[PDB]
Amino acid sequence: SGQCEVPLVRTDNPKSWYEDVEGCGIQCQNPLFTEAEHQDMHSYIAAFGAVTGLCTLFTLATFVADWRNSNRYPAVILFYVNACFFVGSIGWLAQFMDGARREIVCRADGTMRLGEPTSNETLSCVIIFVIVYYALMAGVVWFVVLTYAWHTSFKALLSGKTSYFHLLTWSLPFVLTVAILAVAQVDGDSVSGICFVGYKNYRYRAGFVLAPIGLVLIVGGYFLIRGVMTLFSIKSNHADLEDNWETLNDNLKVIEKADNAAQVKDALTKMRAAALDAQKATPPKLEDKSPDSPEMKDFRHGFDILVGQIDDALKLANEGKVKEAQAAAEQLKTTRNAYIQKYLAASKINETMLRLGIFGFLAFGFVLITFSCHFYDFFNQAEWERSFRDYVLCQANVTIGLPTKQPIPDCEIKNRPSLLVEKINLFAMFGTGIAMSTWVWTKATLLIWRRTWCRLT
Ligand SMILES: CC(C)(O)c1ccc(N2CCN(c3nnc(Cc4ccccc4)c4ccccc34)CC2)nc1
Numbered sequence: 001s002g003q004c005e006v007p008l009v010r011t012d013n014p015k016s017w018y019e020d021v022e023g024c025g026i027q028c029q030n031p032l033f034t035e036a037e038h039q040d041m042h043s044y045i046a047a048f049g050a051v052t053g054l055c056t057l058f059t060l061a062t063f064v065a066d067w068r069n070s071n072r073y074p075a076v077i078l079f080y081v082n083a084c085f086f087v088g089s090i091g092w093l094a095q096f097m098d099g100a101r102r103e104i105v106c107r108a109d110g111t112m113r114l115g116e117p118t119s120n121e122t123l124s125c126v127i128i129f130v131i132v133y134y135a136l137m138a139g140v141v142w143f144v145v146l147t148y149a150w151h152t153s154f155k156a157l158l159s160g161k162t163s164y165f166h167l168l169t170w171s172l173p174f175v176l177t178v179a180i181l182a183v184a185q186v187d188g189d190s191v192s193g194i195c196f197v198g199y200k201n202y203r204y205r206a207g208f209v210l211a212p213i214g215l216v217l218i219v220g221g222y223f224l225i226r227g228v229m230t231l232f233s234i235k236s237n238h239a240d241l242e243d244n245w246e247t248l249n250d251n252l253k254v255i256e257k258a259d260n261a262a263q264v265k266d267a268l269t270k271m272r273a274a275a276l277d278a279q280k281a282t283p284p285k286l287e288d289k290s291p292d293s294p295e296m297k298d299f300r301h302g303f304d305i306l307v308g309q310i311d312d313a314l315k316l317a318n319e320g321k322v323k324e325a326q327a328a329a330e331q332l333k334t335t336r337n338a339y340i341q342k343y344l345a346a347s348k349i350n351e352t353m354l355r356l357g358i359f360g361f362l363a364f365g366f367v368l369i370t371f372s373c374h375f376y377d378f379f380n381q382a383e384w385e386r387s388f389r390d391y392v393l394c395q396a397n398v399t400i401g402l403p404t405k406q407p408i409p410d411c412e413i414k415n416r417p418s419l420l421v422e423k424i425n426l427f428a429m430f431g432t433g434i435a436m437s438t439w440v441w442t443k444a445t446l447l448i449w450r451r452t453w454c455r456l457t
Pocket residue numbers: 026030031032041112189191192196199200377385388417422423425426429
């Protein structure tokens with residue numbers, strides 16, 4: 001035994017000395033976790049890191065294999081999301097290279113990497129931090145771009161905005177990465193096997209992880225609610241029109257096979273009810289436009305004509321003319337196709353837009369979990385530090401000289417981080433990438449790869 005007791009190791013570097021304990025620094029194998037926990041977390045990260053790596057690479061290769069058709073917004077946003085999670089996996093898997101984990105996570109003296117960039121130490125820690133943090137943050141800024149684009153693409157039935165998507169997603173995590181290095185708040189950890197911001201000083205996790213993720217949840221959340229509201233607004237008004245069109249089509253059949261004015265008058269009144277009900281509906285072309293807009297007046301005008309022609313046939317039928325009323329119903333079919341059919345087509349929401357919403361909501365859930373776990377660690381780090389400090393000073397309170405009848409040391413870390421919370425965080429973090437990679441899990445991509453192999457061989 002020597003000058004230092006577990007979890008401190010002997011060091012000649014004063015920048016590594018732990019508070020009042022001169023000549024001792026914190027052992028590189030994170031003292032807050034057991035060896036069994038370390039080996040369990042490394043297997044977890046290796047599994048999740050490799051699967052994210054393979055699934056995102058497949059989605060990247062599938063996009064570039066059909067790059068002529070695939071490079072189209074808002075679908076190509078999923079390509080860039082998958083690129084962030086691919087680059088991210090490399091940073092997480094680097095620790096599995098013979099001896100790289102200890103090279104990334106330890107100082108030259110065998111203590112924990114803290115407050116990096118540190119003078120005279122290698123750059124292995126900052127590079128791994130840059131890859132993991134930049135990829136993690138670019139991936140979530142792309143999530144806000146996914147929610148915004150899905151919200152704004154309903155206005156069709158993104159030109160120019162595409163460059164502002166790239167400017168925002170690649171320069172924002174850049175500014176955040178340079179800011180962390182300027183304040184030097186990168187810390188190493190042997191259980192995650194990476195270097196990251198605010199592991200030790202929890203205030204920096206709050207400002208560089210919780211605040212940016214927090215803001216993407218309120219902004220991304222707002223555009224998801226506005227988009228899902230617009231979607232059910234278009235879907236309901238479309239189905240209303242289809243139901244009114246079907247009512248007009250069925251009562252037109254009745255007037256065609258009628259042999260009395262009472263059968264004609266009854267079907268015309270049911271047609272008049274449908275026309276005035278369909279007039280109340282908001283056309284999909286003006287789903288976000290004024291109720292007195294030029295497009296809105298046009299839609300209503302068509303039904304005013306259609307009502308007039310129903311009433312003109314009703315005047316003849318109400319008095320006694322049967323033949324003169326039935327012939328007018330044939331003319332209603334032309335007015336129907338010229339003034340209504342145009343609006344029953346402008347509300348057909350395509351499959352891309354349908355699953356782009358599913359992916360946005362699914363991505364939101366995983367980012368919300370990530371936020372909650374990062375919040376848990378932020379909130380409880382102050383108590384995990386006083387527990388550790390008390391444990392260190394308990395262990396360092398060693399008997400000096402010949403043995404007196406002193407009781408056996410009784411030291412333990414009271415409260416320590418939750419490995420389960422870290423496993424939930426990493427599950428939702430790597431789970432976003434694996435879930436977003438299933439964007440190309442369609443029958444159409446099976447054909448893209450069939451076509452590619454045939455051209456190669
Ligand atoms: C210096 C000392 C002993 O006081 C100290 C201080 C803090 C500390 N950490 C280690 C890393 N801890 C973790 N934080 N976040 C996460 C989740 C995460 C990391 C990076 C990117 C995204 C999520 C962890 C995942 C696995 C294992 C540990 C994780 C927090 C507590 N460990 C030791």
